[PDB]
Write a protein that binds this ligand. Structure first.
Ligand SMILES: Nc1nc2c(ncn2[C@@H]2O[C@H](COP(=O)(O)OP(=O)(O)O)[C@@H](O)[C@H]2O)c(=O)[nH]1
Ligand SMILES: [Mn+2]
Ligand SMILES: [Mn+2]
Ligand code: NA
Length: 604
């Protein structure tokens, strides 16, 4: 109580009080700031970080900010990310011959050692911020509350954008369940190691842990993104996927968009692509086809549940976009360009001398006079060796500012999903687009997903490889079980490939807003249109079914080319992968789909 500098311990729901005070006794913060989520709290905290050189203000824009990190702490790190369960098998399938790549289990005993070696006294001299936050619209029956303790002001500010945060959240929680989220940069005062670029972090000791059985996320040593903004990956994919398994719903690495045709008919679609494969870009697409409209519900994470009527309802549980900045240009994503010019926090991009932002791929000239400070706080010119922005640099921006944010983006009941799309980067062999033969086939298609690393072609089932909160075999069984709900309206499932390249490494499909031509065919297919031709991998568009006018040289034969040699190779790789990685936990229906694809290919 003596150390509370905002709010009141007496005021917290009892269980929230125990969490705060228990971890205060452990971490030894100098003060405790219970966040209220107010504009005043936000602005004062921003100005404070500014005074201290933790952030700089971008004067070219309205209320925007730039943080530059320790180059040791620049990304979410999978090698340091663990899930603790009594049994390894509940976390990952026990692989047949190899090491698992579907999760990273740590015993409770090992974790307890790691914890006791990190957290005691870790917030000495620092403020513990208490962040009460809702993943999902505040009223929604699909929403879940978390409380994050952190000693990073950069985390509080970013969480205000990426979640719904504040007092109204505590008042909505009452004596209900919440996910316990503990974070420390791991740099108690006085500092024992030198502070780099005013960015507190402890790389040697970084550890991002999930303890689903205790409803706890415990993360240490990193101030960055997914390691520190605990609502996003840790809560909304890892903890949630398991919660969803227990509760009958789904927590997925999916964008949600609403699409409207020239008649005004509207549908919602969800899509799972791995990072750097274009979700944010699709979710706020500027469609090239006249009359068509795409509206954004979320760009990263979907929580979905069948309602009493059998509609699959999806909410975006985030309150903002945490997008990769480099590659973002008016040509590629004009709506992201529009959103990020106010109330936005940037991380590890270059700064122009007039107080604007810059990054590789921004594809927009600088005025004669304007110079560039790189993300490493050094002067920079287009012919230095280093990129001006870090490749994983970011904007953190309010969802409500996207000029095409969907009008139901915050509806507490969610939006009805009629189609689910899978995809990644495949330079060869995979057509632009196909549609699954059935639900069980579609689940197989999700399971089989592969994507060029950003020359290796990696497996990334459902775009969830880094995020499974529990056994992936069980997660497949959970997806298959959806067909066994009597009322369920199972959405059509599609697979796309924006990235097939021709013989000289050039893209066959222009992509971007031209992807609206692919969405149109999907939409028509959901309505039951006779626009599909059967192939060994599923339905592809008929000849002339796609609107290809205005395109120029589009080699359709090569684009939808299905080679026997490639697909024989593809099934072997899928076969081996599923055998090793899922092994005893592979559902029968999946093996059956694998057998069936092998057989259809063998008849070519
Ligand atoms: N060639 C091509 N590139 C794309 C397309 N969509 C997105 N990209 C690029 O893919 C990279 C990642 O895009 P992004 O929206 O950040 O993907 P996310 O990480 O999944 O949200 C960016 O450089 C984009 O310019 C597309 O349709 N075609
Ligand atoms: Mn994205
Ligand atoms: Mn993501
Ligand atoms: Na800094």
């Amino acid at each position: 109580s003596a150390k509370v500098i905002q709010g009141s311990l007496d005021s917290l729901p009892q269980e929230v009080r125990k969490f705060v005070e228990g971890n205060a006794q452990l971490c030894q913060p100098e003060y405790i700031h219970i966040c209220d989520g107010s504009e005043e709290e936000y602005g004062r905290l921003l100005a404070h970080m500014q005074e201290e050189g933790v952030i700089r203000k971008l004067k070219k824009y309205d209320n925007c900010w730039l943080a530059l990190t320790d180059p040791r702490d620049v990304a979410r790190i999978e090698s340091k990310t663990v899930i603790i369960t009594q049994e390894q098998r509940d976390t990952v399938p026990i692989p047949k011959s190899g090491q698992s790549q579907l999760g990273r289990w740590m015993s409770e005993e090992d974790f307890e050692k790691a914890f006791n070696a990190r957290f005691p006294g870790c917030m000495k001299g620092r403020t513990m911020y208490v962040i009460p936050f809702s993943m999902g619209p505040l009223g929604s029956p699909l929403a879940k509350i978390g409380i994050e303790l952190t000693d990073s002001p950069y985390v509080v500010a970013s969480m205000r954008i990426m979640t719904r945060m504040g007092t109204s959240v505590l008042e909505a929680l009452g004596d209900g369940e919440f996910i316990k989220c503990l974070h420390s940069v791991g740099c108690p005062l006085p500092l024992k190691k030198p502070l780099v670029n005013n960015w507190a972090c402890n790389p040697e000791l970084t550890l991002i842990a999930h303890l689903p059985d205790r409803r706890e996320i415990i993360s240490f040593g990193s101030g960055y993104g997914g390691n520190s903004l605990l609502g996003k990956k840790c809560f909304a994919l890892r903890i949630a996927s398991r919660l969803a398994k227990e509760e009958g719903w789904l927590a997925e690495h999916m964008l949600i968009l609403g699409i409207t045709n020239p008649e005004g008919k509207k549908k919602y679609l969800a899509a799972a692509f791995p990072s750097a494969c274009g979700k944010t870009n699709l979710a706020m697409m500027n469609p090239t086809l006249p009359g068509w409209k795409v509206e954004c519900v979320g760009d990263d994470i979907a929580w979905m549940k069948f309602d009493a009527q059998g509609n699959l309802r999806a909410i975006n549980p985030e309150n903002g976009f945490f997008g990769v900045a480099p590659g973002t240009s008016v040509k590629t994503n004009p709506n992201a360009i529009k959103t990020i010019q106010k109330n936005t926090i940037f991380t590890n991009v270059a700064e122009t001398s007039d107080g604007g932002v810059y990054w590789e791929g921004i594809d927009e000239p600088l005025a004669p006079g304007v110079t560039i400070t790189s993300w490493k706080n050094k002067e920079w010119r287009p012919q230095d060796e280093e990129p001006c922005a870090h490749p994983n640099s970011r904007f953190c921006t309010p969802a409500s500012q996207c000029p095409i944010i969907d009008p139901a983006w915050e509806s507490p009941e969610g939006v009805p999903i009629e189609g689910i799309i899978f995809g990644g980067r495949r330079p060869a062999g995979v057509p632009l687009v196909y549609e699954a033969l059935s639900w069980q086939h579609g689940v197989f298609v999700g399971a089989a997903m592969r994507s060029e690393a950003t020359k290796v072609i990696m497996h990334d089932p459902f775009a969830m490889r880094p995020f499974f909160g529990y056994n992936f075999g069980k997660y497949l069984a959970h997806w298959l079980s959806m067909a066994h709900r009597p009322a369920a309206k199972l959405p059509k499932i599609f697979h796309v490939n924006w990235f097939r390249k021709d013989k000289n490494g050039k893209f066959l499909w222009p992509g971007f807003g031209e992807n609206s031509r692919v969405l149109e065919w999907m939409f028509g297919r959901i309505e039951g249109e006779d626009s599909a031709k059967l192939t060994p991998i599923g339905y592809v568009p008929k000849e002339d079914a796609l609107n290809l006018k205005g395109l120029g040289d589009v080699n359709v034969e090569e684009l939808f080319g299905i080679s026997k040699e490639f697909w024989e190779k593809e099934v072997e790789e899928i076969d081996k992968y599923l055998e090793d990685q899922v092994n005893a936990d592979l559902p029968y229906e999946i093996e059956r789909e694998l057998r069936a694809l092998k057989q259809r290919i063998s008849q070519m």
